[PDB]
Amino acid sequence: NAPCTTACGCKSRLLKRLDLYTSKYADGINNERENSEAYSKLVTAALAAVPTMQRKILPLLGAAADILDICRRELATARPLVQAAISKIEEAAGVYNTLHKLERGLGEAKIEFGGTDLRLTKTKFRATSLGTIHTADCPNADEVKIGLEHEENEPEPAKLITHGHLDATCASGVGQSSSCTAVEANTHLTLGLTFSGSSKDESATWNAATNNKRAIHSNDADFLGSNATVAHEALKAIRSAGASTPCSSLITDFNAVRANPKFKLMVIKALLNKPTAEKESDAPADEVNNAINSAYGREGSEYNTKTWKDIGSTRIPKADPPGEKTDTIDKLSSLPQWGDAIARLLLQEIT
Amino acid sequence: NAPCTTACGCKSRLLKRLDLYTSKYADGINNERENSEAYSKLVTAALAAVPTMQRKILPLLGAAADILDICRRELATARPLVQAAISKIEEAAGVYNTLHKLERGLGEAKIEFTDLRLTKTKFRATSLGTIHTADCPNGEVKIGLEHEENEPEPAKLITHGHLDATCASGVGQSSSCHTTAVEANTHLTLGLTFSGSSKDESATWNAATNNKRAIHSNDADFLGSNATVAHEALKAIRSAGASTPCSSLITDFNAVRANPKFKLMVIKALLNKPTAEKESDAPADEVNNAINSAYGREGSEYNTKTWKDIGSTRIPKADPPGEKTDTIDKLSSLPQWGDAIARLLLQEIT
Ligand SMILES: *[C@@H]1O[C@H](CO)[C@@H](O)[C@H](O)[C@H]1NC(C)=O
Ligand SMILES: *[C@@H]1O[C@H](CO)[C@@H](O)[C@H](O)[C@H]1NC(C)=O
């Protein structure tokens, strides 16, 4: 619930939040692949199977088309929102890389006048770390519970650096124990650059005690700007559209089919010998339930262990140069072969 | 193309290059949606149509299944490569944002000392730490997939930080501090800039400190390999042959005619040779004549006629007062087509 506090932590948390959405989107992509295959499997089997089996497949077809169409539309709605979030989060993550390079500051210039005179050459600059960035990897342990249920109250990613600070230390006199006593030959003068999330001006104390390192002026250094806010808003856009979990329903889940009015109606038409029925009330609910239990096991308990196994074992035509052959849907397990089978089965009926 | 030379230009060029690939990928996604619809129309119409139309549909169906399968497999191969490229390019772009803020350096501290005592008021300049805030101007170049193999790696821009020093002593700040010790008229300026090369100008500076020079450099490799890794992710798409996935459309007769499934089904369905399994079962001229009769000469009526006739196919429609019928194009959704298929098969059983 608490905001992130380091560049490594802010970047890790933001990419972990992104992963909540992209992982569900990928689940949806996989589900659409499985649903497209299942629907093709149903159409092909419905054409090829014997009537006792065809009657068990017909109630699945309209419901399966509904599932697949909704699945695909959910993905198409989610796609541009997920893409916008990926691009905005990854841009902010690049900025966090630089914030991590700057976390320890940018070094210092330290003049030690040497004790003989106040002339100056490079050799009196003993510290010249100024301009050195931080090169270490992030620590292995940083950063919090991350999940879609927590996203409504997750705070914005932190900006971390808003100001640059001119740090100064002066020391005049022998031993460098007094305060800048005018700058003289034993004087150490150190100027450095650091960064933080707040403006600083500590000259009030520094001016009476110049031998303590203090931030004596601050300048604006807003690196992230609104990049992290816009990334946060892009994640909210996915949630506001209801697009966080697209294509979660599967044709191979009996509970996704069993609720569809078209399934209950086609049970009546195809399994209760009432083909002209158009309303679920056209057969007694008991007879509908007994037909469902006979066709798919009790309350659909055999929908996967038997019904889909029987669908996959349906024999269909197969091309072969010696003459057309046959094999099962599950052996000829590809759309090109199922399509070829459909054409060959329809040609057979024409012939 | 010469390498990019500014943070704004490097960022813009990398995003423009990425768009070459994401745009083609999006075309593929759109083509897969259109191909899925076309294949479902063909199956539905093949089950419902009159026999003369069914025979024209059957050669399209098998080809369409293979076009759609290839389309989807090409998109599946391309998908992780495009995803990786987008992630890597956008992370690099974020770094370039910061390179733009650093491109004019990070200011300076200018001390201006009657005596050599020191307080902040003698700091005529306290700009150290100020980043550049302006937007990019309105080094940047031809961009296109045919140019990608020759495109240089993105420039790193900043590899080193520089300590810039100036020391000017004496009245009027006219002399060098190597021969005139820091005195009361002296201006001492220490600043930080960045560039793409290491610098050590101290030999000249040590004999004339009143000239601003970079007297020391340190490592400031902000990008690391981030931008080269993004460049290599774009190449990975090209190396996989994945830059234009699902470019074929079932509605393009040239794509259908070129699919290996098409000619045999013409022989089987349109030349009255249903047991044929080889293209050598019919003379090429007869196949061509059957294609011309079914789809117009060289397929020239495939969209103006064949697909209109497919769309006009009448199919069952659910209705509470009893099943009705309407055309595929009026019932223009996969849900209604699937329901129609079930109803058509039931009618055959009945
Ligand atoms: C991030 O901020 C930069 C300025 O550094 C701006 O160009 C860019 O448009 C911002 N990104 C987003 C996604 O708004
Ligand atoms: C970019 O460099 C950072 C270090 O600043 C590193 O953490 C990250 O892995 C790099 N990104 C890629 C995509 O390699």
* Dihedral angle over CA of A65, A69, A74, A76, nearest 10: 150
Domain count, chain B: 3
Phi, psi values for residue A188, rounded to 5°: -105, 125
CB A194 within 8 A of CB A168: no
Residue matched to tokens 């768009």:
B19
Chain A nearest-CA distance from B101, in A, is 7
Q: How far is the CA of A54 from the centre of ligand 1 (A)?
A: 58
List, in sequence order, every residue forming a beta bridge with B216; answer none if it has no partner.
B163
Helix, strand, or coil here: A277?
coil
Together in a domain, B172 and B266: no
Q: Which of A122, A336, A347 is facing B205, going by the closest CB pair?
A: A122
Nearest to B337 by CA among B45, B34, B36, B30: B45
Helix, strand, or coil here: A192?
strand
CA A195 to chain centre: 31
Are B46 and A342 a contacting pair at CB < 8 A? Answer: yes
A159 vs B189: CA distance, rounded Å? 31
With CA atoms as reference, the chain B residue closest to A52 would be B349
Residue B165: inside a domain, yes or no? yes
B86 vs B237: CA distance, rounded Å? 11
B209 vs A132: CA distance, rounded Å? 23
Residues contacting A80, CB < 8 A, separation 6+:
none
Together in a domain, B148 and B193: yes
Together in a domain, B109 and B218: yes
Residue A73: inside a domain, yes or no? no
Within 305-334 of B, beta carbons closer than 8 Å to A belong to 318-323, 333-334
Q: Look at residues B179, B204, B224 and tell me which one is the last residue of a structural domain.
A: B224
Q: Which two tokens stand for residue A283?
A: 């057969």
User: Which residue's CA is the nearest one to ligand 2's atom 7?
Assistant: A97
Q: Which two tokens stand for residue B51?
A: 């026999």
Residue A179: inside a domain, yes or no? yes
Are B220 and A132 a contacting pair at CB < 8 A? Answer: yes
A43 vs A27: CA distance, rounded Å? 24
Reported as half-sphere exposure (CB side, CA atoms, 13 A), residue B70 has a value of: 18
B153 vs B64: CA distance, rounded Å? 41
Instruction: For chain A, give the residues followed by a break (C–N over 2.5 Å).
Output: 142, 143, 180
Q: How far is the CA of A196 from the centre of ligand 1 (A)?
A: 21
Together in a domain, B211 and B116: yes
Residue A177 has what DSSP assignment? -
Q: Which two tokens stand for residue B156?
A: 């790193």
B156 vs B148: CA distance, rounded Å? 19
Residues of B in contact with A322 (CB under 8 A): 277
Nearest to A213 by CA among A170, A176, A165: A170
Together in a domain, B208 and B152: yes
Chain B nearest-CA distance from A149, in A, is 25
Are B216 and A122 a contacting pair at CB < 8 A? Answer: yes
Reported as half-sphere exposure (CB side, CA atoms, 13 A), residue A172 has a value of: 14
Within 23-62 of B, beta carbons closer than 8 Å to A belong to 29, 33, 36, 39, 43, 46-47, 51, 54-55, 58-59, 61-62
Print the SS3 string covering chain B: CCCCCCHHHHHHHHHHHHHHHHHHHHHHHHHHHHHHHHHHHHHHHHHHCCHHHHHHHHHHHHHHHHHHHHHHHHHHHHHHHHHHHHHHHHHHHHHHHHHHHHCCCCCEEEEECCCCCCCHHHEEEECCCCCCCCCCCCCCCCCCHHHHHHCCCCCCCCCEEEEEEEEEECHHHCEECCCCCCCCCCEEEEEEEEECCCCCCHHHHCCCCCCCEEEEEEECCCCCCHHHHHHHHHHHHHHCCCCCCCCCCCCCHHHHHHCCCHHHHHHHHHCCCCCCCCHHHCCHHHHHHHHHHHHCHHHCCHHHHHHHHHHCCEEEECCCCCCEEEECCCCCCHHHHHHHHHHHHHHHHC
Nearest to A128 by CA among B107, B124, B199: B199
With CA atoms as reference, the chain B residue closest to A218 would be B129
Residues of A in contact with B25 (CB under 8 A): none
Helix, strand, or coil here: A318?
strand
A230 vs A224: CA distance, rounded Å? 10
Together in a domain, B233 and B207: no
Residues contacting B305, CB < 8 A, separation 6+:
B295, B296
Residue A210: inside a domain, yes or no? yes
Phi, psi values for residue A167, rounded to 5°: -90, 135
Q: Which two tokens stand for residue A220?
A: 């604006």
Nearest to A105 by CA among B189, B95, B109, B128: B128
Are A86 and B91 a contacting pair at CB < 8 A? Answer: no
Together in a domain, B231 and B327: no
Distances in Å between the Cα of A115 and the Cα atoms of A212, A213, A305, B194, B207 are 21, 21, 91, 32, 21
Residues of A in contact with B46 (CB under 8 A): 342-343, 346
Residue A24: inside a domain, yes or no? no
Residue A298 has what DSSP assignment? G
Are A46 and B342 a contacting pair at CB < 8 A? Answer: yes
Helix, strand, or coil here: A41?
helix
Together in a domain, B112 and B213: yes
Q: Which two tokens stand for residue B64?
A: 């369409």
Out of A98, A161, A230, A232, give the residue to mutate to test ligand 1, the one with the largest number of ligand atoms within 8 Å of its CB: A230
With CA atoms as reference, the chain B residue closest to A58 would be B342
**Resolution in A, one decimal?**
1.4
A269 vs B331: CA distance, rounded Å? 21
CB atoms within 10 A of CB A52: 8
Query: Which ligand has an atom closest to residue A99 CA?
Result: 2
Together in a domain, B207 and B139: yes
Together in a domain, B5 and B147: no
Residue matched to tokens 């290599």:
B232
Q: Which two tokens stand for residue B142?
A: 């031809």
Residues contacting B301, CB < 8 A, separation 6+:
B295
Are B95 and A92 a contacting pair at CB < 8 A? Answer: no
Nearest to B123 by CA among A191, A325, A68: A191
Nearest to B224 by CA among B85, B88, B53: B88
A22 vs A334: CA distance, rounded Å? 28
Measured from CB, residues less than 6 Å from any atom of ligand 1 are: A 88, 91, 225, 227, 230; B 97
Q: How far is the CA of B94 from the centre of ligand 1 (A)?
A: 8
| DSSP string covering A106-172 | --EEEEE-TTT-S---GGGEEEE-TTPPP-PPPPS-------GGGGGGPPPPP----EEEEEEEEE-
Residue A129: Cβ-neighbour burial (10 angstroms; 0-12, 13-18, 19+): middle
**Per-residue b/e over B177-215, b at no fewer than 16 CB within 10 Å?**
bbebbbbebbbbbbbbbbbeeebebbeebbeebbebbbb
- Flag whether residue B98 sits within 8 Å of chain A, measured between CB atoms: yes
Cα angle, residue A135 at apex, residues A134 and A140 outer, rounded to 5° = 105
List, in sequence order, every residue forming a beta bridge with A188; answer none if it has no partner.
A112, A171
User: Which residue's CA is the nearest one to ligand 1's atom 4?
Assistant: B97
| Packed helices B7-48 and B334-349: angle between N→C axes, nearest 10 degrees | 20
Query: Which ligand has an atom closest to residue B86 CA?
Result: 2
Residue B319: inside a domain, yes or no? yes
Which DSSP helix (H) or strand (E) runs through A191? strand A188-196
Domain limits for position B335: 313-350
Which DSSP helix (H) or strand (E) runs through A196? strand A188-196
**Per-residue b/e over A66-91, b at no fewer than 16 CB within 10 Å?**
bbbbbbbebbeebbebbbbbbbbbbb
Residue B308: inside a domain, yes or no? no
B300 vs B290: CA distance, rounded Å? 13
Together in a domain, B80 and B114: no
Instruction: For chain B, give the residues followed by a break (C–N over 2.5 Å).
Output: 113, 138, 140
Q: Which two tokens stand for residue B291?
A: 């294609």
CA A210 to chain centre: 51
Together in a domain, B114 and B218: yes
Report the sign of the C-alpha dihedral through residues B199, B202, B207, B210, in that order.
positive
CA A286 to chain centre: 46
Print the SS3 string covering A199-253: CCCCHHHHCCCCCCCEEEEEEECCCCCCHHHHHHHHHHHHHHCCCCCCCCCCCCC
Which of A91, A206, A325 is the best residue to mutate to test the B interface, defined by the most B CB atoms within 10 Å of its own CB?
A91
CB atoms within 10 A of CB A201: 14
Helix, strand, or coil here: A4?
coil
Within 251-290 of B, beta carbons closer than 8 Å to A belong to 261, 264-265, 268-269, 274-275, 277-278
Are A109 and B39 a contacting pair at CB < 8 A? Answer: no
CB B98 within 8 A of CB B222: yes
Residue A275 has what DSSP assignment? T
Are A342 and B180 a contacting pair at CB < 8 A? Answer: no
Residue A64: inside a domain, yes or no? no
